[PDB]
Design a binder for this molecule. Structure first.
Ligand SMILES: *[C@@H]1O[C@H](CO)[C@@H](O[C@@H]2O[C@H](CO)[C@@H](O[C@@H]3O[C@H](CO)[C@@H](O)[C@H](O)[C@@H]3O)[C@H](O)[C@H]2NC(C)=O)[C@H](O)[C@H]1NC(C)=O
Ligand SMILES: *[C@@H]1O[C@H](CO)[C@@H](O[C@@H]2O[C@H](CO)[C@@H](O[C@@H]3O[C@H](CO)[C@@H](O)[C@H](O)[C@@H]3O)[C@H](O)[C@H]2NC(C)=O)[C@H](O)[C@H]1NC(C)=O
Ligand SMILES: *[C@@H]1O[C@H](CO)[C@@H](O[C@@H]2O[C@H](CO)[C@@H](O)[C@H](O)[C@H]2NC(C)=O)[C@H](O)[C@H]1NC(C)=O
Ligand SMILES: *[C@@H]1O[C@H](CO)[C@@H](O[C@@H]2O[C@H](CO)[C@@H](O)[C@H](O)[C@H]2NC(C)=O)[C@H](O)[C@H]1NC(C)=O
Ligand SMILES: *[C@@H]1O[C@H](CO)[C@@H](O[C@@H]2O[C@H](CO)[C@@H](O)[C@H](O)[C@H]2NC(C)=O)[C@H](O)[C@H]1NC(C)=O
Ligand SMILES: *[C@@H]1O[C@H](CO)[C@@H](O[C@@H]2O[C@H](CO)[C@@H](O)[C@H](O)[C@H]2NC(C)=O)[C@H](O)[C@H]1NC(C)=O
Ligand SMILES: *[C@@H]1O[C@H](CO)[C@@H](O[C@@H]2O[C@H](CO)[C@@H](O)[C@H](O)[C@H]2NC(C)=O)[C@H](O)[C@H]1NC(C)=O
Ligand SMILES: *[C@@H]1O[C@H](CO)[C@@H](O[C@@H]2O[C@H](CO)[C@@H](O)[C@H](O)[C@H]2NC(C)=O)[C@H](O)[C@H]1NC(C)=O
Ligand SMILES: *[C@@H]1O[C@H](CO)[C@@H](O[C@@H]2O[C@H](CO)[C@@H](O)[C@H](O)[C@H]2NC(C)=O)[C@H](O)[C@H]1NC(C)=O
Ligand SMILES: *[C@@H]1O[C@H](CO)[C@@H](O)[C@H](O)[C@H]1NC(C)=O
Ligand SMILES: *[C@@H]1O[C@H](CO)[C@@H](O)[C@H](O)[C@H]1NC(C)=O
Ligand SMILES: *[C@@H]1O[C@H](CO)[C@@H](O)[C@H](O)[C@H]1NC(C)=O
Lengths: 724, 724
């Protein structure tokens, strides 16, 4: 029987399908099929061809994306897509009028447009061009320029800078339409005094001279960009200047962040602010006073969230989900025991009321109606690495009803959901630990309407392959239960002793051990090279309580490192793991941990790989770093900024085999970091291996580069484990 | 018996001494001994302490170097040394009076001084600070400012830019005093429109953001800097200005280089100009007029040098060696048979007379007397790799007497000399093949006056070691003699079979197969690991004829590559070479040839190492590249610029093991060149090994890095050669 070879991983020979849809109603969604865009109605099961693939290639050129207007009158076509960063880009957009079924030729959308978003209702447009905000009341209507200070690397209106897109918003967008489309809320960023990172780009062999790329990148303690929030009335845009909503006073004592903007009603806006010392968060509720007319942000509806053991939220404070009347909201907060649970806020009330509790966390709030609230939790079977859909009755909080627990309990233990408007229907997505699945459900009776994708083709293709097995198990460290996972080789024999390879992230609020089904590189090693690939969620991990999560606070590189070693020591006690063939590798925080582990002097690991590793917290951006480590000042936390460098551990690298990989175009984890490591390894008489990948970004993902780094790492591990 | 250990190379426990001296008279020379500067009198032989080691330490700073005035009244002390580039720096200077045993504190020399030069007679000073020339007729005097348009990276007066420093002048100085100290000639460079290479420098772990380093670097085809030559009357300057000496019309038809400036008499100057297409140079003899025009350059005394087969000279045209009257000069030129020989030029007459001939070349003219001319050639036994001192009676060209050939014909075959003023005495300098030896001679009888350094302790300390033996042999390629060297392991047994390591430079006018004595890394591989290390000098090599050397013209990366292969194949046919264990490595042109050899698909070499290689001549500087490859224009030589890249040979790297090393702060061979290779090797799916060295220049020389790179390369060889 065939095995999962390396070519099977790198060539995507074994494709896993999914089912991605866009709810455009309370009962209709769009789905792309055979390059056609089909419009499905879940209330009747009937579906029409909404957008022929004929009218996708008959424009002049290849179209990259689409976005249909909420009134289904116009379609945006995106083409000439040029990648900027993780979530950012610039492209040209066309407008396709569906009433005439004709392409719009006048009042077009300029080339090099950065952002674009429809209004929630109707057909109004807002786009960002040369870092300025423009609005179009109609595709057949001239643009209205809102801002005029758009300066590259200085001022951005409506689009995020680098740190916000990466570490806060997780999207390039800084436009927020009002539900009626009357108001637009946009953010203005100012990176004028933010220091710049500079790295060279060695483009095609034609380029005689390299390019120098500049990016405003505040490192730990550096000058941070400012943000201001302005609101604009689209219906009477030529009456007043954009109205700034000043941040609350609580956050104005120094530098601060803007982390979320949500619309409660057609005339009420909510702003989540965050201090720079990220243990203080506040929600401001602002109503439109049509008199002056200003935005009236009453103090009595300010809502504070703090943390005594560290920072607020998991990565950033939870976003509020307002009720249909915008006079209350539900947001996730840590209870007294330190577990993320759902709390009920009244806009005018100073306290919140918890509606869920237990020794388990709530992952997120998925949908909200007047009678039920839908959410995801890791409560089922007390397994933190699982995800299941629940619903809460808003009259009797004791009446919690899991919607995914008993559907296929052996095959599916990791669910997610995508709801429609008003939570009439919801798409269920199972991710593991067996073959994924996608189904359509109706919230009225929670019955499966139809099976969207079963991956049956995947199922039979794996039947002919000696696939490895994934075990979800746990262990105890100083009396605390800690979960881990093992990818076991096929025909696993506990009497025989296998080599061990540890996959690390160990990042704050990370979770590497979970009931998810992946066709990864580890799948190759176990199925073919018969290597046990493990991952251990120790201290600093998430979804297990603020006790375990905040243990790493202000002490990065201390406990998440020891516990990877200590768990590795536990694995040796088992009778099926070779003591002399234990390895480790990571990526962008594992590479930090993997490096910091090999420098611990543990005599546990034989070799290691660090891919785009962090080497010192002095080098990473302030938003992620200062959240867990604070400021590098002698008065705040400068001590452990220095005590936690990989370079301080060079001498102990004489005992292991180090392989260091890093891409040169890395805008996230700068090549400066790996360079500082090698200088410490060189200056210490330590021999090691290295490999750069030219013009590859942080997540090395170019087809040629993705295949090369893993084919390189396979040779390394096989040489370290003395494998064929 | 012990062997030459790797630690013996990297730690230099087994030191080799040398005798370095500064002739300050016709019979006196300065010599440093235990940090004391001693004055020696060659005539009788006695000695006296000229400068105590109390100094260099009694002043508040460690003194790097010293320089004594010709009239022996003042001494310069160099401190605050900050290395700029290869031959450049910037440092601070203190002036010390000898008649008063005092340190001058009035009218001091500024810090951050970029150059300093004494007049050849008297004690006139000339230093360059902020790219402007300042002059002092006496150390106790103010500094008259000559130029005022100095600007960083834009204009340089008196100091070279990068390309002139590296590829023409081999010095940072662009000052030329007249013999009487009356005139000062200085050149002015303009890099205003020359593109700037940029690379990042990752300083100490405490240095948060990296520093971008800009350097005016004209790559092949780019805009070269302009150069103008001015002369100043130092005696009466407050009245007069500098006087420009315009280049000949022969050279003003385009871009041109200034390659030499020599003072014939107190009022006569010789300028060597060079066309950008380096097959046309001219010497200009310019006389001083007591009225305007300040400098009268007669047309009838222009002297022009051309080459129809390639470029002019070896690296640059030979410099002229004037007679005492300045009415004639000897210089090295190619004859009709293509052999560099000495020619006698007469200023006014347009032809020259060869005073030497034969199928061998002259290396350099060492000294000129009114009766004899001393020079260095490779005539003895027809060995190009040997150097000996000869002398010609300037009356009887037939009386050509060797002064070193038959001293120790078994120990010494690679001589050089450092003559005194007027050539009364000359230090003989033997460099191999056996242990070096330094002796002092008298010109009147060529009789050894005394033995300066015999390296006796080095002789004894070597007999404790199984030291290798180096053979200088030759082979015929297509009926053309080609020489090679073989470092042979001790106790050589031609019945056995040895691994083969081919050290490659193979650059134009290069010589890797000589009769010199080096304690190198090749010694370790032969003494300890029993590896034969060979070096072959094929087509493109110098000192053998312009037929052999200019065969590389406009065809770089073609013939010097193939010849290395076939010589290795001829090494394969030998009975003592393991065909399956042949490897090759090189540095900075060898890395180019090594990479180009491994890409040829010859199945000859098993593995290879390329350290700081050239990947594409499009990326190297113009002065070097255009000299041998022409212009990368579709009309001149664009094609073999394209055809000669390493990246075009990526596929054939699947058959060899490849290790690529490069310094991140390399300004000579930019990191871009290595990065372009890996991208082609990544795009071809070829696995290889790489290793960067942060902030290491082209000649990776940091004490820590130098050990790490040779240690890293040894592991690669042993693994490739299947050794312990
Ligand atoms: C974007 O940010 C930059 C810098 O973060 C802002 O410009 C800077 O504004 C400050 C004051 O806010 C200026 O500093 C000093 O102001 C005092 C006032 O007494 C004055 O006396 C000093 O001479 C000095 O100017 C600073 O000069 C200025 N820097 C600039 C203009 O480069 C800028 O206003 C921000 N823009 C937006 C749209 O947010
Ligand atoms: C150092 O080199 C720079 C760049 O070559 C010199 O400045 C440049 O001079 C040229 C003229 O040779 C200017 O080009 C154009 O000339 C035409 C002639 O009609 C004129 O119409 C244009 O308006 C322009 O002047 C060029 O602008 C100028 N570039 C600058 C000043 O940045 C410079 O003179 C050289 N310096 C020395 C000391 O030799
Ligand atoms: C969208 O909502 C806004 C605010 O609710 C509407 O604006 C107000 O509309 C009311 C009546 O609905 C008027 O009495 C006010 O004079 C309006 N004030 C402002 C500032 O607009 C807006 O008309 C609504 N638009 C649509 C298309 O529903
Ligand atoms: C948020 O964290 C900061 C520092 O991490 C806390 O600042 C402390 O403030 C008190 C004043 O009440 C000082 O006495 C301490 O010295 C401060 N600590 C440091 C390390 O500077 C702040 O109290 C925290 N906020 C909350 C609400 O817990
Ligand atoms: C959807 O795919 C699953 C596989 O994940 C199918 O379930 C298997 O069906 C076979 C029948 O031959 C049983 O023997 C297996 O035990 C089942 N496995 C699991 C994990 O349930 C299922 O039949 C497919 N459904 C459809 C409609 O095709
Ligand atoms: C060492 O060489 C020096 C060279 O300067 C000799 O210098 C002598 O200096 C005295 C001083 O009055 C003169 O009178 C002599 O004429 C110099 N000698 C010569 C040869 O010129 C010095 O003599 C030498 N050493 C000794 C011990 O005499
Ligand atoms: C150095 O040489 C220069 C030129 O050879 C001398 O300058 C000339 O000196 C003579 C007589 O002293 C004058 O008639 C000329 O007018 C001078 N010409 C110039 C250009 O200066 C100079 O005097 C000599 N100085 C020394 C110290 O030897
Ligand atoms: C110096 O080199 C150039 C370039 O190789 C030579 O220019 C050639 O000249 C001949 C005759 O004028 C032309 O037919 C060629 O087309 C020229 N080649 C180029 C590339 O322009 C020039 O002749 C050489 N100089 C000497 C003295 O031989
Ligand atoms: C100078 O050094 C050379 C070699 O470095 C010495 O020459 C050797 O001398 C020994 C006698 O002890 C002979 O056995 C060797 O055959 C000699 N070798 C050569 C190449 O000649 C020489 O003795 C040293 N001279 C002094 C004065 O120390
Ligand atoms: C376009 O859609 C039709 C609908 O069946 C399908 O047959 C055809 O293959 C599609 N073409 C492309 C290029 O996707
Ligand atoms: C489904 O049927 C209803 C009623 O028959 C119709 O109004 C609707 O348009 C149909 N769906 C589509 C996508 O046309
Ligand atoms: C200085 O010179 C004296 C005289 O020979 C010598 O004894 C001493 O060791 C020297 N000191 C240094 C530091 O070179």
């Amino acid at each position: 029987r065939r095995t999962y070879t390396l070519a099977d991983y790198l060539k995507s020979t074994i494709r896993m399908r999914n089912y991605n849809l866009r709810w455009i109603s309370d009962h209709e969604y769009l789905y792309k099929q055979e390059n056609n865009v089909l419009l499905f109605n879940a209330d009747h099961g009937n579906s029409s061809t909404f957008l022929e693939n004929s009218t996708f290639d008959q424009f002049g050129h290849s179209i990259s994306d689409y976005s249909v207007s909420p009134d289904r009158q116009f379609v945006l076509f995106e083409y000439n897509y040029v990648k900027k960063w993780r979530h950012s880009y610039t492209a040209s957009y066309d407008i396709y009028d569906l009433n005439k079924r004709q392409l719009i030729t006048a009042e077009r959308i300029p080339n090099d447009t950065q952002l674009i978003r429809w209004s929630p209702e109707g057909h109004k447009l807002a786009y960002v061009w040369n870092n300025d905000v423009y609005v179009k009341n109609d595709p057949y209507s001239p643009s209205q320029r809102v801002t005029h200070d758009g300066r590259e690397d200085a001022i951005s209106n409506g689009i995020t800078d680098w740190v916000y897109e990466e570490e806060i918003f997780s999207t390039h967008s800084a436009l927020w339409w009002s539900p009626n489309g009357t108001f637009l809320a946009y953010a203005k960023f100012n990176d004028t005094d933010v220091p710049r990172i500079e790295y060279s780009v060695y483009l095609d062999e034609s380029l005689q001279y390299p390019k120098t790329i500049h990016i405003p990148y505040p490192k730990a303690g550096a000058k941070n960009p400012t943000v201001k929030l302005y609101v604009v009335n689209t219906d009477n845009l030529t009456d007043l200047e954009p109205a700034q909503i000043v941040a609350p006073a609580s956050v104005l004592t120094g530098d601060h962040y803007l982390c979320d903007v949500t619309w409660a009603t057609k005339e009420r806006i909510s702003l989540q602010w965050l201090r720079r010392i990220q243990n203080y968060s506040i929600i401001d509720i602002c109503d439109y006073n049509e008199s002056t007319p200003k935005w009236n942000c009453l103090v009595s509806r300010q809502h504070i969230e703090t943390s005594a053991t560290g920072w607020v939220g998991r990565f950033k404070p939870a976003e509020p989900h307002f009720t249909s009347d915008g006079n209350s909201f539900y947001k996730i907060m840590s209870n007294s025991e330190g577990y993320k649970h759902i709390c009920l806020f009244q806009i005018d009330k100073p306290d919140c009321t918890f509606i869920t509790k237990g020794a388990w966390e709530v992952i997120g709030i998925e949908a909200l109606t007047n009678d039920y609230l839908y959410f995801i939790s890791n409560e089922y079977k007390g397994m933190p690495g699982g995800r299941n859909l629940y619903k809460i009755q808003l009259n009797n909080y004791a009446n919690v009803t899991c919607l995914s627990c008993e559907l296929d309990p052996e095959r599916c233990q990791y669910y997610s959901a995508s709801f429609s408007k008003g939570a009439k229907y919801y798409q269920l997505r199972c991710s593991g630990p067996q073959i994924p699945r996608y189904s359509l459900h109706s919230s009225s009776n929670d019955k499966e309407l139809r099976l969207l994708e079963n991956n049956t083709a995947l199922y039979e293709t794996l039947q002919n392959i000696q696939m490895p097995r994934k075990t979800l198990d746990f262990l105890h460290l100083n009396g605390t239960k800690f979960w881990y996972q093992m990818i076991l080789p096929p025909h696993f024999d506990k009497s025989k002793k296998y080599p061990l390879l540890i996959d690390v992230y160990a990042g704050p609020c990370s979770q590497k051990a979970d009931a998810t089904f992946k066709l990864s590189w580890a799948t190759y090693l176990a199925s073919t090279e018969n290597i046990i690939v493990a991952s251990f969620d120790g201290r600093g991990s998430g979804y297990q309580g603020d006790k375990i999560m905040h243990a790493i606070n202000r002490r990065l590189g201390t406990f998440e490192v020891e516990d990877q070693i200590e768990a590795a020591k536990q694995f040796s006690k088992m009778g099926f793991v070779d003591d002399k063939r234990i390895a480790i590798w990571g990526w962008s925080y594992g590479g930090y941990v993997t490096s910091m582990v090999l420098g611990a002097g543990s005599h546990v690991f034989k070799c290691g790989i660090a891919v785009a590793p962090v080497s010192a917290w002095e080098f990473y951006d302030s938003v992620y770093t200062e959240r867990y480590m604070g400021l590098p000042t002698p008065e705040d936390n400068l001590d452990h900024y220095k005590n936690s460098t990989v370079m301080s551990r060079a001498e102990n690298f004489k005992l292991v085999e180090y392989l260091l990989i890093h891409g040169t175009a890395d805008d996230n984890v700068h090549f400066q970091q790996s360079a500082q490591i090698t200088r410490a390894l060189v200056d210490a008489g330590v021999d090691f291996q290295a490999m750069w990948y030219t013009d590859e970004d942080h997540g090395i993902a170019t087809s040629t580069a993705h295949q090369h780094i893993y084919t390189h790492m396979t040779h390394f591990i096989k040489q370290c484990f003395s494998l064929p």
